[PDB]
Ligand binder design. Structure first.
Ligand code: HEM
Ligand code: HEM
Ligand code: ARG
Ligand code: ARG
Ligand code: CAC
Ligand code: CAC
Ligand code: ZN
Lengths: 416, 414
């Protein structure tokens, strides 16, 4: 039949073919010999710091492709305006080695990068992203102002709104604008005398960096970290987020009255800040984006991963379960109640959140929309299927094709 | 070249060098990954009316023969050289060759060891291999199958086993077991399209009826076997009820669970896969071990396209099925899995929970890293269908590739 991947949904028995993958111009880590789809960080999209200017030929081809994508999106492909823009880009790159995007092109590209993210289950919302243009930012202090504005707009007192703030693109020879923190809101991780960690173990390095740079540390389990913001060719500067701007949700359980006593909590805004936004060859090294949480992110991964808060055993003990044997399914029982507590608490505090069932159902709709609109949707099965109750959600039974499309969000080396 | 494999829970790293020994291609390419696809688009197993290229078969055969003598620490030995000549001579004169029982045993165990989707491979060394190549009729296939089931069931103390029927031969029909497993429950289509029993077995159920089987009308009617000898219509055989051990499902604390009338068989015996050893193909080689509880409690009983009992259990539990956010599905699934474990344990029937299983697989990965420099594994199949990240394998990166000997999918014989 069709010379494209045949994709089947085993729950419904339906079949689709992915023709969109044909547009991928960037190779992933797999080969006919072996599949490396499970690797979290495969040395592929890795946007290593490339000081020397990018090959004008490579950049130009990437730029032309993007401009073509833009004009096709506004249904003016092949038009005079299209050819004139292509000429403007080539001319600008010719005399300067690089080029700049028009406002509308940046908005289109940022939304397309989200739309193209294979690991994001919230993509049905891709068209509603609010793009803040911060390409005029010229200092770390101003970065903080833009970030604070992003946080206030995005949080919106609990009725969260997707948003991305785009700071100046990388420029040949010149230093990058960088946000050192992995997220705008993160809890400190303090190494202890015995070797253990108080707080979030995932943030030990950034916490120590904040200290090395003048931050007076606290000693709690949920201390919000300050931000290390860096402007071109300058040492990073430290900024403490005004507490009133960081909305948090104390965790309680709907029926287990003792759960509130655990003193657990989490912040409302998930804002990834260390990824690179690539559009038509241009690289935006500082472009924090945010949406709202899918509950298993907090309840299962952040709170129960062995290398994170690891609270499974503490909650199981409180539930008086047999943590002495696997067959009691104590981990499963505790995890369920922890996830329920998260949903219950966010709902009580009127803070946007989506459970894994609702999220995956909406992602199935997204897949259907994209099948019609683009002939497919790049998706990373391992990241799309929730960490708990996998096969109880519709995406588990949906085969998926994973590939890289641009514009895109990519991992980049740490600035230190 | 060799992939860096990281375990995110422990921060440890390893390098898979075993993948370089892969001579068979998967469905992925640098342009796109198709790792979540269940069945092969082209990597199927085309007909055997004509003999495979002598050089291709010979190369696969020599490699296998090499693997064998290396396993018994006798490479380069006189026996090794003589065996290679025997194989060469047979292929050159007949276009095919035959394995000696010791080689077949080694090959069957290696195929299991190489299965990327199997989480129970720590047991790979203990596999009872039954040589059924001395079989010339459907009736004889039935006798071997019944003996397989008796041995493997062992009154609830399950033992891993495989029975190997005659290999495929050029231009001749295949020996085949039409059923997907030796023990399966019927699936009867009814008036309004619904299905009574296991929806996954509708087609096979109908084929049996079409071949003379008098259908029952329950939700758990054990199906008869359709066994086929070369170029002959398949024959119907009813398995003796006393050979099929089943476990009634009840819950440790929820008295009403037992009232659901749920049950499941003790022996999981896949019978429609092809066993490939040294270029040779065994179209009928049913194998079995024991169940990991999520297979029954989560997939078989809760999949939307299977028994789909989630809502029934949720109602008996009086959960708030009004919204997804009450996590009623999650709560019910957990109790159903607990009921499965409780019931098998009560009935003294072998079974392993997903935590114990994944823990053993992590040990297997370490054992294999030391022994062969890696282990082919399919993450989507290794990580359990519920509580994924609550198990160690979720946090372990894996490399998937095809090694031979191997178990592979093949077209349905109808
Ligand atoms: C509207 C709400 C949204 C939801 C519920 C959602 C949910 C998720 C989830 C569950 C993941 C995987 C999390 C993990 O396992 O670490 C993810 C990954 C991702 N999302 Fe979204 N997302 C949303 C909004 C956004 C926005 C606004 C953007 C970008 C403009 C975005 C970009 C991405 C990217 C690039 C990743 C992958 C990051 C990585 O590789 O580590 N998401 N999202
Ligand atoms: C001893 C206990 C065993 C356990 C606990 C076990 C468990 C599993 C599990 C959970 C799967 C995935 C099942 C699914 O999701 O449908 C699987 C797949 C598989 N197992 Fe095992 N296994 C065992 C014994 C065996 C034996 C003895 C063989 C072969 C000699 C074997 C060969 C395979 C193969 C080839 C697959 C993939 C089947 C497919 O692609 O559908 N397993 N096993
Ligand atoms: C927008 N939901 N999720 C983005 C990833 C955030 C990360 N998984 C966390 O739990 O903090
Ligand atoms: N543990 C095993 N040997 N499993 C083999 C696959 C059986 C299949 N998952 C079933 O539910 O029947
Ligand atoms: C509830 As605590 C022990
Ligand atoms: C057992 As209730 C209906
Ligand atoms: Zn792959």
């Amino acid at each position: 039949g069709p010379k494209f991947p045949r994709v089947k949904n085993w729950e419904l028995g339906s079949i689709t073919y992915d023709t969109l993958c044909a547009q991928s111009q960037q190779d992933g880590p797999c080969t006919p010999r072996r599949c490396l789809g499970s690797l979290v960080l495969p040395r592929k999209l890795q946007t290593r710091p490339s000081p020397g200017p990018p090959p004008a030929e490579q950049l130009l081809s990437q730029a032309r492709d993007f401009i073509n994508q833009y004009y096709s999106s506004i249904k003016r492909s092949g038009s005079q305006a299209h050819e004139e823009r292509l000429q403007e880009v080539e001319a600008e790159v010719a005399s300067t080695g690089t080029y700049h995007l028009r406002e509308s092109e940046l908005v289109f590209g940022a939304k397309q990068a989200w739309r193209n993210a294979p690991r994001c289950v919230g993509r049905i919302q891709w068209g509603k992203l609010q793009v803040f243009d911060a390409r005029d930012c010229s200092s770390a202090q101003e970065m903080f102002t833009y970030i604070c504005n992003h946080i206030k707009y995005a949080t919106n007192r609990g009725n969260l709104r997707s948003a991305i703030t785009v700071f100046p693109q990388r420029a040949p020879g010149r230093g990058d604008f960088r946000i050192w923190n992995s997220q705008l809101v993160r809890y400190a991780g303090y190494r202890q005398q015995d070797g253990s960690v108080r707080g979030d173990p995932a943030n030990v390095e950034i916490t120590e960096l904040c200290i090395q740079h003048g931050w007076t540390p606290g000693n709690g389990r949920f201390d919000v970290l300050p931000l290390l913001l860096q402007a071109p060719d300058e040492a990073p500067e430290l900024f403490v987020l005004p507490p009133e701007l960081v909305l948090e949700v104390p965790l309680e359980h709907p029926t287990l009255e003792w759960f509130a006593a655990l003193g657990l909590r989490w912040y409302a805004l998930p804002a990834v800040s260390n990824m690179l936004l690539e559009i038509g060859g241009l690289e935006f090294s500082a472009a924090p984006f945010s949406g709202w949480y899918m509950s298993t992110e907090i309840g299962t991964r952040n709170l129960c991963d062995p290398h994170r808060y690891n609270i499974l055993e503490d909650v199981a003990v409180c539930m008086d379960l047999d943590t002495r044997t696997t067959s009691s399914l104590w981990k499963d029982k505790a995890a369920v109640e922890i996830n329920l507590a998260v949903l219950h608490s966010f709902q009580l505090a009127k803070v946007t959140i989506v459970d894994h069932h609702a999220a995956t159902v909406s992602f199935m709709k997204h897949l259907d929309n994209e099948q019609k609109a683009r002939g497919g949707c790049p998706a990373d099965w391992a990241w799309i299927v929730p960490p708990i109750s996998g096969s109880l959600t519709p995406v588990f039974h949906q085969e998926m094709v994973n590939y890289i499309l641009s514009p895109a969000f990519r991992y980049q080396p740490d600035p230190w």
